[PDB]
Symmetry: C6
Subunit: 207 residues, 6 copies
Amino acid sequence: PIVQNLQGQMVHQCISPRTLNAWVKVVEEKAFSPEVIPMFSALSCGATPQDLNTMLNTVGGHQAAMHMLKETINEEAAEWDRLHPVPIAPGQMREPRGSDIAGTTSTLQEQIGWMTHNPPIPVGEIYKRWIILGLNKIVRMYSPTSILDIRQGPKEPFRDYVDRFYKTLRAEQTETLLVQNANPDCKTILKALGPGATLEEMMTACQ
Amino acid sequence: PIVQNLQGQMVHQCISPRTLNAWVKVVEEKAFSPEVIPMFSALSCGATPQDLNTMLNTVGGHQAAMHMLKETINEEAAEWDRLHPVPIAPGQMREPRGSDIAGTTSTLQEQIGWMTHNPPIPVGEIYKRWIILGLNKIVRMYSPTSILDIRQGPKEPFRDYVDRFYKTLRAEQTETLLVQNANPDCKTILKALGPGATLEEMMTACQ
Amino acid sequence: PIVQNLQGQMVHQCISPRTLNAWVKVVEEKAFSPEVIPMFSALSCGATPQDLNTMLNTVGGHQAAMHMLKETINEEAAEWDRLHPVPIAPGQMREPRGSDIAGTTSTLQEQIGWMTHNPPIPVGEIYKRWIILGLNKIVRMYSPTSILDIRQGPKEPFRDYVDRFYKTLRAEQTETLLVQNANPDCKTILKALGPGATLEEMMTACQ
Amino acid sequence: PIVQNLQGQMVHQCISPRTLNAWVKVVEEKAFSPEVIPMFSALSCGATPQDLNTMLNTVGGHQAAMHMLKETINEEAAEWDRLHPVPIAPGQMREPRGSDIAGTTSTLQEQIGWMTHNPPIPVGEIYKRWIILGLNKIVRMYSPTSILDIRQGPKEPFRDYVDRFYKTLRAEQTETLLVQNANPDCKTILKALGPGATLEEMMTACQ
Amino acid sequence: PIVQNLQGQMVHQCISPRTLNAWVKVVEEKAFSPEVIPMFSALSCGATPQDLNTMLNTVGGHQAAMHMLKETINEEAAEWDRLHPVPIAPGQMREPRGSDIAGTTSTLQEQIGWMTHNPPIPVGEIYKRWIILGLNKIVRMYSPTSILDIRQGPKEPFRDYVDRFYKTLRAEQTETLLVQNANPDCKTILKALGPGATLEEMMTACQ
Amino acid sequence: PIVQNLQGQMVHQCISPRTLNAWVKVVEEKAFSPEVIPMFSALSCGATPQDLNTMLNTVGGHQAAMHMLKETINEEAAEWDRLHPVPIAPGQMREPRGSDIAGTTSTLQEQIGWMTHNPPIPVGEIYKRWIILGLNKIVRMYSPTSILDIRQGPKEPFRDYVDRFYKTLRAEQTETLLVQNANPDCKTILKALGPGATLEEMMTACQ
Ligand SMILES: CC(C)(C#Cc1ccc(-c2ccc(Cl)c3c(NS(C)(=O)=O)nn(CC(F)(F)F)c23)c([C@H](Cc2cc(F)cc(F)c2)NC(=O)Cn2nc(C(F)(F)F)c3c2C(F)(F)[C@@H]2C[C@H]32)n1)S(C)(=O)=O
Ligand SMILES: CC(C)(C#Cc1ccc(-c2ccc(Cl)c3c(NS(C)(=O)=O)nn(CC(F)(F)F)c23)c([C@H](Cc2cc(F)cc(F)c2)NC(=O)Cn2nc(C(F)(F)F)c3c2C(F)(F)[C@@H]2C[C@H]32)n1)S(C)(=O)=O
Ligand SMILES: CC(C)(C#Cc1ccc(-c2ccc(Cl)c3c(NS(C)(=O)=O)nn(CC(F)(F)F)c23)c([C@H](Cc2cc(F)cc(F)c2)NC(=O)Cn2nc(C(F)(F)F)c3c2C(F)(F)[C@@H]2C[C@H]32)n1)S(C)(=O)=O
Ligand SMILES: CC(C)(C#Cc1ccc(-c2ccc(Cl)c3c(NS(C)(=O)=O)nn(CC(F)(F)F)c23)c([C@H](Cc2cc(F)cc(F)c2)NC(=O)Cn2nc(C(F)(F)F)c3c2C(F)(F)[C@@H]2C[C@H]32)n1)S(C)(=O)=O
Ligand SMILES: CC(C)(C#Cc1ccc(-c2ccc(Cl)c3c(NS(C)(=O)=O)nn(CC(F)(F)F)c23)c([C@H](Cc2cc(F)cc(F)c2)NC(=O)Cn2nc(C(F)(F)F)c3c2C(F)(F)[C@@H]2C[C@H]32)n1)S(C)(=O)=O
Ligand SMILES: CC(C)(C#Cc1ccc(-c2ccc(Cl)c3c(NS(C)(=O)=O)nn(CC(F)(F)F)c23)c([C@H](Cc2cc(F)cc(F)c2)NC(=O)Cn2nc(C(F)(F)F)c3c2C(F)(F)[C@@H]2C[C@H]32)n1)S(C)(=O)=O
Ligand SMILES: [Cl-]
Ligand SMILES: [Cl-]
Ligand SMILES: [Cl-]
Ligand SMILES: [Cl-]
Ligand SMILES: [Cl-]
Ligand SMILES: [Cl-]
Ligand SMILES: [Cl-]
Ligand SMILES: [Cl-]
Ligand SMILES: [Cl-]
Ligand SMILES: [Cl-]
Ligand SMILES: [Cl-]
Ligand SMILES: [Cl-]
Ligand SMILES: [Cl-]
Ligand SMILES: [Cl-]
Ligand SMILES: [Cl-]
Ligand SMILES: [Cl-]
Ligand SMILES: [Cl-]
Ligand SMILES: [Cl-]
Ligand SMILES: [Cl-]
Ligand SMILES: [Cl-]
Ligand SMILES: [Cl-]
Ligand SMILES: [Cl-]
Ligand SMILES: [Cl-]
Ligand SMILES: [Cl-]
């Protein structure tokens, strides 16, 4: 990543073995659960496009998703080229192309040059926004259960039902559907509460 | 987080893989036990609102609690706006809104600017206080057993009973109830001790 | 903790995830064995009162001991107030109270101010001494076996017996009792050695 | 590796135990899966030829591949000598040979001298490009299944089939073959979609 | 420990959680095997007497050995007082006593003052030499098997026998006894080799 | 080890717990496999003779090999004394002896003085070369199988056979013997290939 040293200047740092292993492990354990996306964003703090491509390529398996990611990246790369239509002088920064932001036609020194410019061209943050966009579309598609099928069981604790409800809702990307899909006993209690009840009040009443 | 370097200036640091993994793991293992809250506070030392949102979003599951957390955060964010009613000049700090402190309408550079100002606007500590408030309400609600039902067994060691008693009491958020819920043999000993006995004296007498 | 940087000045550092996890784990594995106390002291090197309270609060369970710890802390806090009886000027250090040293009525900035003063008021070391005092009283009470009941078995190796003997003695908080509680065969050998024998000589003779 | 300190100068650093162990472990677990190559590239960030040889030599087993790697390295080393045909003055940098870039006839001080020169001779990056070239040829040869034999099962979820398809394709080093190898039911749906369908659209239709 | 910063001055550093855990773990796994002593010496690099006492006190169990260690320490402390017989002026270093070097009557600031003096009084290295002396006496006593009882089996590989032979010899604290305790077949071969054979030659001949 | 700080000067650093544990673990898991030697060389980057002796002494077991190592070290130490035959002035570097390079008659300060001299006397690298020499002789002797006995099985995959072939060859310290020891079916194919075939071509043909 590009990180500021202990003297106030932005310099390049090698991606750490702890960072590399943490990203690989979370994909192995959680696949494309919704909480994997913020983990990717945190673990790629200050990452260059090269670092972002590194993280994606260390993922073995889920290659269907990785190809969807490339398609989303190319869509965003093509949009950037339509919003930013371009001899380049000696020793002198060039504007980046979509494929430059994606790290495919640009060198690390070029990415360092853009990201540390004054003002900086944050090709890493632009690329990361493309990746998260594509990652979120994967999260929705891999969500196994629709919110319409999350209904509280006749003996299911309300707490467990709300857990499944909003876990599903988070991947699908509320309060009245949560009441409608509650079981008959709790749904009866939740209507007596009236409108405007908080989740805390609702869960307390069906305890 | 925002941490001071080895030269005496406050700069931004990327949240570490060790920090990210430590928060995720403790939630996986302890859920919303009372001791999870001080762990969250320590692991979020110097955190920005972005870092605080990062930590919350890496939690998979317990999504019912996370939605209660959002409701508490919005309540505190709405209160801040009622206590701090607001053209913004070029290059110049703006007062934060409730959603700015919660990291939803503010950028990282803006959060860095507030937290490192002189005097600093500690939007991270303000947000953290909101989160801990909401986290504590979750701890009370998820406490499975009431203090009224913690009574020493006829053969239960007094040490084990006091452990369960104050473990329950900590989540519920004393000395006379501890005597009343003791078993007949120990309760007899504890009355002979008289008032003002310490916990050490009480546990010694029923050993 | 408060640690000196690489330039010779005392500044605040966030308690590390490795430190937090190491304290939690040792309590989970060893409870209140005697060797847990020096581990707590080492892991709290340079800790502020806030850091000391952090470490105590990350302990889940053993809540009976934690309440005994609070009682000991309040006793020491009350003593400090009796030994140090107190408008506070603008921007100007105030003497600490017992509850200030215990981190309950003092801010982190105040604790940093005391600990880094010239001369420093080591509220962290004062608090730590209170905690270790209370922790040691827990170690004695949780010692399951009295030294009077540690006697060498008729076929127990002398090495194993001495291990149990001084393990028990360490928690209870010597040489002649070790001879008296030895088995008949070894006790006969140990009297023939005479007075003033070292532990090495004693263990060698009963090998 | 050669890394810039916190003062802006490139100096030598010892390869870390975390780096050494991370490379060994990934080879033990994944052998020559395609994602092992980007892991090698990231873990060898800023590596000298000595560091690159270190990483290769810590690999136990897969010695057939390591000998293929040497053959590829010698081929690239011989090419470099044909593109760069060479008394060397006292204290004065010499041009490198193919075996110098491969770390076999050059010292660490010589590699440091080339890599930190102005302008730098990046013998580490040149060597790394040779290694990755040879590593990729191993990935293709060790790919067990050909893309022609990746066909969706009659009850295999389309997602799982695309995973295997592009996993195989990645090692072999698309969209119309993916349709042809789909099962009859899904292939019927995919033709109705028409040309130019994205992977996301294709996977959605066969869900 | 006392370690030099990145600016060339000796300052105090808190003993690390990795150091504390590494010492505890090696004692748990290897007890008082001979190789535990050099591990203790390496892990206590630059340690103060306080750090050395910390490491000893984190050891749970083996309390018989720890009491032998104290007896050896007191013997060396008494010797130092006999070799170094002693108003102390304000703000001014005092010569250390045996108990000062052992960390029992001296503060950390005093130990820092001695160790960083010019010229330095290395109370840490003096104490460490006392500890290693006592630790080595424990290694000899806990050696279970005498060298006289290490004899090669009639079908035992010579390599395995030499391993046990010098493992035992290392704890007991050679070449002709190794031949005498070899089995008849190998002993016959080893006499034909003649005097002055290396261990490599000896092991080769009995392979 | 001796490592350069972040200011460009060579200073002493304590051997890290990660380094110590990594060397011990690899010996426990791999014994004297060929790849253990480059691991030792990397983990001893910049090591002093004291650090090199530390690493050897933390190895428990394999004491036969460690005694062969001492014999090789003494041989190299005796050679150095024959190539470098020696009042030493106050405060003034002395030439090292063989036992000085091996760390047996020299202090750490003396080793630091030699290694950081201008020009430096690299007693650590000289000692390390002695150790690796002796370690390699152990690798050859502990190789269980000779290359003459590595022959491809009638149903053994050629890839697996080449793996065993060069694994054995690496420890023993090629292309025509690999053909001769192939099975009849593959050997027939390999002769049809003709001379000068690469390993990649050979393995491809027998696939
Ligand atoms: C950069 C990056 C790392 C980021 C970010 C990021 C940025 C801002 C915010 C946020 C913070 C506080 C509030 Cl009060 C609101 C709000 N208030 S409101 C009117 O109630 O919605 N909204 N937001 C998002 C915003 F921006 F959209 F406004 C927020 C979040 C929250 C952080 C959070 C997590 C948590 F657990 C509990 C919290 F209290 C807060 N994370 C989400 O909210 C995700 N989420 N989604 C849904 C669903 F859809 F199912 F309902 C659900 C959540 C949920 F909160 F987890 C919980 C079960 C419900 N994260 S990134 C690109 O990788 O993602
Ligand atoms: C920032 C953050 C990390 C913090 C903080 C924080 C700040 C201050 C204090 C504190 C410190 C010392 C004393 Cl003497 C008292 C006191 N003296 S008194 C008159 O006896 O109560 N009070 N306090 C709290 C205060 F502030 F309220 F005053 C304290 C604590 C204690 C730390 C502590 C833990 C411990 F194990 C043993 C100790 F000796 C001290 N932690 C708690 O006390 C929580 N707790 N709750 C209850 C219950 F309710 F069940 F009884 C119980 C505890 C318990 F101690 F664990 C124990 C079983 C009993 N923590 S945060 C926002 O994440 O939490
Ligand atoms: C800050 C902190 C981390 C500290 C400290 C701290 C400070 C000083 C000392 C100490 C050091 C050397 C000597 Cl020679 C003596 C001594 N000489 S003497 C006349 O023989 O007793 N005394 N001391 C304590 C002093 F200060 F009281 F003098 C010491 C210790 C020893 C360190 C030690 C541990 C060890 F394993 C082996 C050693 F050789 C030395 N640790 C203890 O001694 C605890 N202990 N208790 C008993 C029992 F009671 F059962 F007998 C037993 C021990 C035992 F040693 F483990 C062993 C089985 C016997 N630690 S803290 C507040 O968290 O604790
Ligand atoms: C230095 C080093 C570490 C590097 C690099 C490196 C450099 C650039 C790029 C890259 C980035 C973005 C796009 Cl949009 C394209 C593109 N757009 S396009 C017209 O669709 O192909 N192409 N590229 C490569 C380029 F350079 F060739 F252009 C890219 C990659 C991608 C990174 C990536 C991984 C991922 F998972 C998902 C992504 F969105 C992006 N990694 C690959 O693409 C490897 N891969 N191969 C195939 C296959 F062949 F099977 F189809 C498949 C992949 C796959 F993506 F994983 C996925 C299943 C499909 N890596 S190194 C020497 O060690 O490797
Ligand atoms: C500070 C500290 C960490 C230290 C140190 C320390 C200091 C110096 C030396 C040393 C180095 C090289 C040589 Cl050539 C000789 C030598 N040459 S010689 C004429 O043949 O003996 N002697 N020495 C010791 C010296 F100083 F005494 F001279 C050495 C050692 C060796 C290091 C070593 C370990 C190893 F595995 C293989 C090696 F090649 C070298 N470690 C020992 O030798 C311990 N050992 N003991 C015996 C036994 F007794 F069974 F035979 C046996 C060993 C053994 F080597 F392991 C092996 C099985 C045989 N360590 S500390 C206080 O914690 O210990
Ligand atoms: C300091 C230290 C850490 C070092 C070093 C060190 C220094 C240089 C080199 C080296 C690098 C590149 C080439 Cl192209 C050749 C070459 N070209 S050539 C004409 O084909 O032989 N030769 N060399 C050695 C040199 F110096 F001798 F020239 C090399 C190596 C290689 C590194 C390497 C490992 C690898 F896996 C794959 C590679 F492509 C390169 N490591 C070895 O080669 C060891 N090895 N041995 C044999 C055997 F004998 F069985 F055939 C076999 C290997 C093998 F490669 F693993 C593989 C199965 C075959 N390491 S240290 C003192 O601890 O060891
Ligand atoms: Cl995966
Ligand atoms: Cl790739
Ligand atoms: Cl821009
Ligand atoms: Cl509930
Ligand atoms: Cl969870
Ligand atoms: Cl999210
Ligand atoms: Cl404010
Ligand atoms: Cl008790
Ligand atoms: Cl616990
Ligand atoms: Cl608490
Ligand atoms: Cl004071
Ligand atoms: Cl014994
Ligand atoms: Cl392997
Ligand atoms: Cl090798
Ligand atoms: Cl070039
Ligand atoms: Cl799908
Ligand atoms: Cl132990
Ligand atoms: Cl103790
Ligand atoms: Cl001295
Ligand atoms: Cl052998
Ligand atoms: Cl071993
Ligand atoms: Cl030793
Ligand atoms: Cl020389
Ligand atoms: Cl093959």
